[PDB]
Amino acid sequence: MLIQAVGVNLPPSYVCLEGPLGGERPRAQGDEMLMQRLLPAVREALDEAAVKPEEIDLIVGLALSPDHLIENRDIMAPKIGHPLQKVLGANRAHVFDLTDSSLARALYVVDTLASDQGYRNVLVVRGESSQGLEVDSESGFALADGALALLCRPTGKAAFRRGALGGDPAQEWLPLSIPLNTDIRQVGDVKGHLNLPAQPGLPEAVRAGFTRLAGDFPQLNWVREEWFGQGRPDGRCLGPFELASQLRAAQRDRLDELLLISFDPFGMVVEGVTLELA
Amino acid sequence: MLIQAVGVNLPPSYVCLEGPLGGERPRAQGDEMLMQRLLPAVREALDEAAVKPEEIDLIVGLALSPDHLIENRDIMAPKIGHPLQKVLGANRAHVFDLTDSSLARALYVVDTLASDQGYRNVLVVRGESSQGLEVDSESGFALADGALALLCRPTGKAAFRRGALGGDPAQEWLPLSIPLNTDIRQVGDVKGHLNLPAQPGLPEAVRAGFTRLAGDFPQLNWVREEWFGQGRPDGRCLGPFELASQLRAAQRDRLDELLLISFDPFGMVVEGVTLELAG
Amino acid sequence: GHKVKLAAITCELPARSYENDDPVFAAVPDLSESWWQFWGVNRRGYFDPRNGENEFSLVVRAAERLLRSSDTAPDSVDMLICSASSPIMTDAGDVLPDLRGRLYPRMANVLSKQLGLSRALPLDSQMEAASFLLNLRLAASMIRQGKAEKVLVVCSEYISNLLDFTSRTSTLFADGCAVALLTRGDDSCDLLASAEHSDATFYEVATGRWRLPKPRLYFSLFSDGQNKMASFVPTNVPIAMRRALEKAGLGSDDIDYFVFHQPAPFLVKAWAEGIGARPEQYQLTMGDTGVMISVSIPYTLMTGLREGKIRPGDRIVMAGAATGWGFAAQVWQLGEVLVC
Amino acid sequence: GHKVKLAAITCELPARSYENDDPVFAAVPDLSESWWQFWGVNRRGYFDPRNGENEFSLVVRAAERLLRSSDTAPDSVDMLICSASSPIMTDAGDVLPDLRGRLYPRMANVLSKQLGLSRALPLDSQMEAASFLLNLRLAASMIRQGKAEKVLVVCSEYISNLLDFTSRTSTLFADGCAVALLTRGDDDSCDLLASAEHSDATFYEVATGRWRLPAKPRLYFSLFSDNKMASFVPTNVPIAMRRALEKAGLGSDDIDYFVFHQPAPFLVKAWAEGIGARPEQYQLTMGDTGVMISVSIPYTLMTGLREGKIRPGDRIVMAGAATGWGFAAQVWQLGEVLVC
Ligand SMILES: [Cl-]
Ligand code: NA
Missing domain, CATH: 3.40.47.10 (Thiolase/Chalcone synthase)
Incomplete structure (x- = not known):
């Protein structure tokens, strides 16, 4: 998998949440919806790579947000890849969604499918506009809002690793879940609740997982997602969106290859994919 | 036909057009549409009579305006009676439209149909939001804009008369036509043109027609439409909407019966209908 | 009278x-x-x-x-x-x-x-x-x-x-x-009885609008499933027929023949079934004419007369739907009708 | 490979x-x-x-x-x-x-x-x-x-x-x-010989899931006259099949059997006729199960195998459409499949 370009568009408004899994993260406001940020991020990437919408072979979406996706804020399905195809004029694309996949896992799977199908231009998008989910007030866990666009050229050569978290190997980490709101009375009530129990050693265990996994490709520089504020400048973190500034640093540094490392709070694992750079 | 109640709502802007068929008439502005004006007129009448929307048996519309009827200003069909039924919740009603009919004629026909079907509450509505029609700049002829709601209780007893115009018997009167605009290029362009040839004796001929017709019911006070400004204070005229203040004067004066007279510019005739008033 | x-x-x-x-x-x-x-x-x-x-x-x-x-x-x-x-x-x-x-x-x-x-x-x-x-x-x-x-x-x-x-x-x-x-x-x-009613729930579904290159048909259905008519399709036309029959003091069995508006075979059949009309008690006439808006009913009436399906002394029901939406039914006792 | x-x-x-x-x-x-x-x-x-x-x-x-x-x-x-x-x-x-x-x-x-x-x-x-x-x-x-x-x-x-x-x-x-x-x-x-997948979002908004108060996701329909797809209904499924066949270097005539998504009989037939499939070369299974969204295809495949319609060594095409909208076709050379 070769990364041709990256686009990012994040809300300017940040919200801080206390707790061992807390931090200061971008947050979509009021009525704002994902497409408002996703479309410019995608355009940014298309413009950088000099690829037209009609040249896109595949669009693959990753978005947990259960509403606030498009102009009709109550739509949850079909998923955002479809209206994205429409507003782009991506008239040659196949569109599907990978749900709760990590980005690293999605890139690997997509590299594999897309190289096997002979595709040349593949769009992977990750986004959130999470007003429809209640934050975890006990742990401080929340999703970063915003949009990331990766315009890729498949090679079928991306290598992949799925690794355990570090720290105490007997510790049963409690995963993220998103229960449905069973008391939806009014318009604008949340549709679900973020539930990630307070586990103060978790950020460090994730970092230790990253460091172990990076050892499978010890000559590659690596980039990673930052889902927690602990230990970070300003306590600020961008979740998977943190990847953008790091990929851009890599392009600036003229790297040909790198390791991209995701954290999956559903599986409580870390996942890495090896990528080429334009 | 018994008139239970009347609602009227006219634009605040009166616009003067010069010409033998000119006058100063109410005019809808910008993107105003007929429903905005009609709905409150209708509600005034329903509130006065204490008649609920679900009690309405029949809704009959009269509106020439080829657009500016409802929220979507480009819709012309189906006609305004149908979205009216929707917004009111008039869920027991039958809805139809009588097109280019005069009001007197519509009231007669409706009295007849509705008494024969046993209806009790009938809503006859007349309105214009005529931005979609070009005024007749040569004659000065324009439609008055506004809304009139007549809540009726049919009796089947309404008498009707259709009469010729007055003035010179040898004079051939040239009717109103509304040709289609054959050069609709932009949005906001008119859909048709008001074409009523300049005929300076026409206002007086209509008025003499009114008087002749009224002579068939010498026992009745009468009310009439005024479509032309010639000879009227400040050239002000309200077209069919002139009827509202006259009907209210009639109730205040405790009239039980009256004659209502319309001018039909399409047929160039005058038409009268006899009505009872509530009280 | x-x-x-x-x-x-x-x-x-x-x-x-x-x-x-x-x-x-x-x-x-x-x-x-x-x-x-x-x-x-x-x-x-x-x-x-x-x-x-x-x-x-x-x-x-x-x-x-x-x-x-x-x-x-x-x-x-x-x-x-x-x-x-x-x-x-x-x-x-x-x-x-x-x-x-x-x-x-x-x-x-x-x-x-x-x-x-x-x-x-x-x-x-x-x-x-x-x-x-x-x-x-x-x-x-x-x-x-x-x-x-x-x-x-x-x-x-x-x-x-x-x-x-x-x-x-x-x-x-x-x-x-x-x-x-x-x-x-x-x-x-004689016209024995009629019934007419209207329902504007779905008014906006079929409208005429001025359209630059003049009036054009526009479709516009936006629904949840939760906002239905008081009487569900396809019962509005049958309901009108029933109300008419009742006013005339008659039942469906008292009727010889039926004349319907002609929008599609399934809909006509649904209306016929809703009132008790058997398939041989009405015609489908859209075949060589298409759907002629207001003219389908009279053309169907005329066809039935002309072909001997409807004859003197027959009791008939005429019924149909219209955009807006509107519904009408009539119960006629027919004498001899001149087809010309 | x-x-x-x-x-x-x-x-x-x-x-x-x-x-x-x-x-x-x-x-x-x-x-x-x-x-x-x-x-x-x-x-x-x-x-x-x-x-x-x-x-x-x-x-x-x-x-x-x-x-x-x-x-x-x-x-x-x-x-x-x-x-x-x-x-x-x-x-x-x-x-x-x-x-x-x-x-x-x-x-x-x-x-x-x-x-x-x-x-x-x-x-x-x-x-x-x-x-x-x-x-x-x-x-x-x-x-x-x-x-x-x-x-x-x-x-x-x-x-x-x-x-x-x-x-x-x-x-x-x-x-x-x-x-x-x-x-x-x-x-x-x-072996999987070839596949073709494509999507068309023209009518994305026609069938959506929305959070609706009475409160859960519901199907919502939206059609407005105020564009058509590049390929008109009902050709998208046949187009996917043709692409897949071309990629496999085969023709319709090289195919033994077909397995379709099951939304309605006329649509399945239209897809079959679009590719040249004869009625004896596929089954309609919605009669017994209803429309099972993603499960209709594999249920249909399983049915064909179980009933001996699809045999070892057969070449088959599997195909369907999905909301969004999406279209997929696959050309398989099948061996022995354990139906369990
Ligand atoms: Cl797992
Ligand atoms: Na005269």
């Missing part, structure tokens, strides 16, 4: 017929045998104005033929009731000889003068596809109350000039005219 | 079957034989969560059966690919015993722990009704490129807990589950 007689009826269709495979449909998406069977359409006519056919000229022809054939003097017609669903009229004959494409006046004001109907009160009514029934109903009330003795009823549908021939919907609709004569009866024929 | 073997397949349907006249439909507007004929539905199942039946429990049952029957050690499974069209999941077994109604996680993470699939990469994908094809496609690319030797594929549709039994739409859809096993093939006897 007086008994109402359905005295005579005629129709005038376009001279030219267009098959399902006709090149007029070249820009329409390919349609299969499945579509044609489902809608029940095989061919249809469109007015050719270049050759003098239009909403007015054909009505003049049909009306002149009917008046001659029914031995009706023009001066004896007390009311003329016309309907035309298109907002655009195109011809005013000798009456307004220079006027071509127009919004107003409507037909009756002009047709009355063209035909020399010098005592006829002119009226132009609109209830879309149910307009023939509305007009029979208006006519019947006038006759019954003694306010008219002879009423001429017209429906004329020039819809082909508004159709979008890039669209599948353009394959369903077609042009045509109908004229009927109603008179004071005695006493072989 | 390793060969891809479709090794095994099974389904798990609800224990209870519901007829068209079943009282579960009492609040649905009355429907006729016209509705039932058109959609081709006679009966369908709904999961009963009170008797332990749901999207998760029935998959666990089916998957355990398939693994036991195909002699597949849980350790040997390299990847697990799940789909479920409903946004709501309801049960996480022994893994998350307290969690009930949920948006996330999806199935694969949880299922792989429940089944002991200790090496399986979990993936949850979404392409609505076409998800079984997507999943085979993903599985095949992984096998083909040497990245997996065994892949378990799951589609599970629990739609009945979302259906509005006051709506006609409730009569069309039903519940079910399917599980398949793909492996690296030894010999030439089984």
Whole structure:
């Protein structure tokens, strides 16, 4: 998998949440919806790579947000890849969604499918506009809002690793879940609740997982997602969106290859994919 | 036909057009549409009579305006009676439209149909939001804009008369036509043109027609439409909407019966209908 | 009051017929045998104005033929009731000889003068596809109350000039005219009862809108499933029939034959089943005409008379739906009807 | 280029079957034989969560059966690919015993722990009704490129807990589950020869799920006249089939049998006729199951295998459409498939 370009568009408004899994993260406001940020991020990437919408072979979406996706804020399905195809004029694309996949896992799977199908231009998008989910007030866990666009050229050569978290190997980490709101009375009530129990050693265990996994490709520089504020400048973190500034640093540094490392709070694992750079 | 109640709502802007068929008439502005004006007129009448929307048996519309009827200003069909039924919740009603009919004629026909079907509450509505029609700049002829709601209780007893115009018997009167605009290029362009040839004796001929017709019911006070400004204070005229203040004067004066007279510019005739008033 | 007689009826269709495979449909998406069977359409006519056919000229022809054939003097017609669903009229004959494409006046004001109907009160009514029934109903009330003795009823549908021939919907609709004569009866024929109602829930589903390259059909359904009519489809037409039958003190078994509006075979069948009508008690006529808006009902009535399916002394129910939405039903006892 | 073997397949349907006249439909507007004929539905199942039946429990049952029957050690499974069209999941077994109604996680993470699939990469994908094809496609690319030797594929549709039994739409859809096993093939006897997938978002907004107050996701319809697809209905499925066939260097005539998504009989026929498939070369299965979203295809495949319509050594085309909209076709050379 070769990364041709990256686009990012994040809300300017940040919200801080206390707790061992807390931090200061971008947050979509009021009525704002994902497409408002996703479309410019995608355009940014298309413009950088000099690829037209009609040249896109595949669009693959990753978005947990259960509403606030498009102009009709109550739509949850079909998923955002479809209206994205429409507003782009991506008239040659196949569109599907990978749900709760990590980005690293999605890139690997997509590299594999897309190289096997002979595709040349593949769009992977990750986004959130999470007003429809209640934050975890006990742990401080929340999703970063915003949009990331990766315009890729498949090679079928991306290598992949799925690794355990570090720290105490007997510790049963409690995963993220998103229960449905069973008391939806009014318009604008949340549709679900973020539930990630307070586990103060978790950020460090994730970092230790990253460091172990990076050892499978010890000559590659690596980039990673930052889902927690602990230990970070300003306590600020961008979740998977943190990847953008790091990929851009890599392009600036003229790297040909790198390791991209995701954290999956559903599986409580870390996942890495090896990528080429334009 | 018994008139239970009347609602009227006219634009605040009166616009003067010069010409033998000119006058100063109410005019809808910008993107105003007929429903905005009609709905409150209708509600005034329903509130006065204490008649609920679900009690309405029949809704009959009269509106020439080829657009500016409802929220979507480009819709012309189906006609305004149908979205009216929707917004009111008039869920027991039958809805139809009588097109280019005069009001007197519509009231007669409706009295007849509705008494024969046993209806009790009938809503006859007349309105214009005529931005979609070009005024007749040569004659000065324009439609008055506004809304009139007549809540009726049919009796089947309404008498009707259709009469010729007055003035010179040898004079051939040239009717109103509304040709289609054959050069609709932009949005906001008119859909048709008001074409009523300049005929300076026409206002007086209509008025003499009114008087002749009224002579068939010498026992009745009468009310009439005024479509032309010639000879009227400040050239002000309200077209069919002139009827509202006259009907209210009639109730205040405790009239039980009256004659209502319309001018039909399409047929160039005058038409009268006899009505009872509530009280 | 007086008994109402359905005295005579005629129709005038376009001279030219267009098959399902006709090149007029070249820009329409390919349609299969499945579509044609489902809608029940095989061919249809469109007015050719270049050759003098239009909403007015054909009505003049049909009306002149009917008046001659029914031995009706023009001066004896007390009311003329016309309907035309298109907002655009195109011809005013000798009456307004220079006027071509127009919004107003409507037909009756002009047709009355063209035909020399010098005592006829002119009226132009609109209830879309149910307009023939509305007009029979208006006519019947006038006759019954003694306010008219002879009423001429017209429906004329020039819809082909508004159709979008890039669209599948353009394959369903077609042009045509109908004229009927109603008179004071005695006493072989009568309108026993009628019922009319309207429901505007789905008003916005089918509208005419001014569209730059003039009126065009627009569709607009936005629904949850939760906002239905008080009476669900397809029971509105049956409900109208029942209300009419009840007012007449009759049941379905008292009826010989049924005449329906003709939008699709499944819908007509649904209406028939809703009231107890057996398949052989009505005809499907959309096959060689297409859907002619207000003119489908009278054309179907006439067909049934002409083919011997409906005859003197028969009790019939006529019924249909219209955009808006509107519903109408009539119970007639028919005497002898002149088909001309 | 390793060969891809479709090794095994099974389904798990609800224990209870519901007829068209079943009282579960009492609040649905009355429907006729016209509705039932058109959609081709006679009966369908709904999961009963009170008797332990749901999207998760029935998959666990089916998957355990398939693994036991195909002699597949849980350790040997390299990847697990799940789909479920409903946004709501309801049960996480022994893994998350307290969690009930949920948006996330999806199935694969949880299922792989429940089944002991200790090496399986979990993936949850979404392409609505076409998800079984997507999943085979993903599985095949992984096998083909040497990245997996065994892949378990799951589609599970629990739609009945979302259906509005006051709506006609409730009569069309039903519940079910399917599980398949793909492996690296030894010999030439089984392979995925080619596939084609495409999407068209022109009519994206026509059928959407929305959060609606009475409060849960509901189907919402939106059609406005205020563009057509590049390829008109009903050609998108045939276009996908043609592309796949071209990529495999085959023609329609080289194909033994066809397996289609099952939304309605006229549509399936239209797809078949578009590619040149004869009526004896495919089955209609919606009659017994209802429309099971993603599960209709694998149920149909399984049916054809079980009944001897699809035999070892046959070349088949599998194809369908999905909301969004999406289109997928696959050309398989099949060997021996364990139906369990
Ligand atoms: Cl997992
Ligand atoms: Na005179």
